């Protein structure tokens, strides 16, 4: 049907603010946001892969794309989260 990130947004919200809710419009805005960043990152990764004549998008391409799009401290923290997640998943 119509997919959204609503349930995941809600789980994150409960982690960070147990006593805070969210309106329907705000959840819709969050979904728009997530889709936007998704498209940007996937597109940048696509160009990265083409420039280097590689046919596979790997986590390394994701990391480089993240370094290009996010500024400074946001980029460093994102890289930290990505690395921890890949390391925990791998084992």
């Amino acid at each position: 049907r119509k997919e959204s990130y609503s349930i995941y947004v809600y789980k994150v919200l409960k982690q960070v603010h147990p006593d805070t809710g969210i309106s329907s419009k705000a959840m819709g805005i969050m979904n728009s946001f997530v889709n936007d960043i998704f498209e940007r990152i996937a597109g940048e990764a696509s160009r990265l892969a083409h420039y280097n004549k590689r046919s596979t998008i790997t986590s390394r391409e994701i990391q480089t794309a993240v370094r290009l799009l996010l500024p400074g401290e946001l980029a460093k923290h994102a890289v930290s989260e990505g690395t921890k997640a890949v390391t925990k998943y791998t084992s």
Binding site: R47, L48, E61
Partner: protein, 87 residues
């Protein structure tokens, strides 16, 4: 194994007459004395952003030499497409 002299104060190589000449191309007839430092700062910021992106591309390819194509892509993704340096 005979590296160049450590780079310092190179911002001063952007001389006063050079900035004046650039301003002439922009149609500026008279120039306040304080313009020069401001211009230097702006230029430095611009350069930082470009070089950062270029080097990121260089590292992704696991190369140690920044190529013209690296620069073209960096500029392109900032909406300042540059013609003349392809291939």
């Amino acid at each position: 194994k005979r590296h160049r002299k450590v780079l310092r104060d190179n911002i001063q190589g952007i001389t006063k007459p050079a900035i004046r000449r650039l301003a002439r191309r922009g149609g500026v007839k008279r120039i306040s004395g304080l313009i020069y430092e401001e211009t230097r700062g702006v230029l430095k910021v611009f350069l930082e952003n470009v070089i950062r992106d270029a080097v990121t591309y260089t590292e992704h390819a696991k190369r140690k030499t920044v190529t013209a194509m690296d620069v073209v892509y960096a500029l392109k993704r900032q909406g300042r497409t540059l013609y003349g340096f392809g291939g």
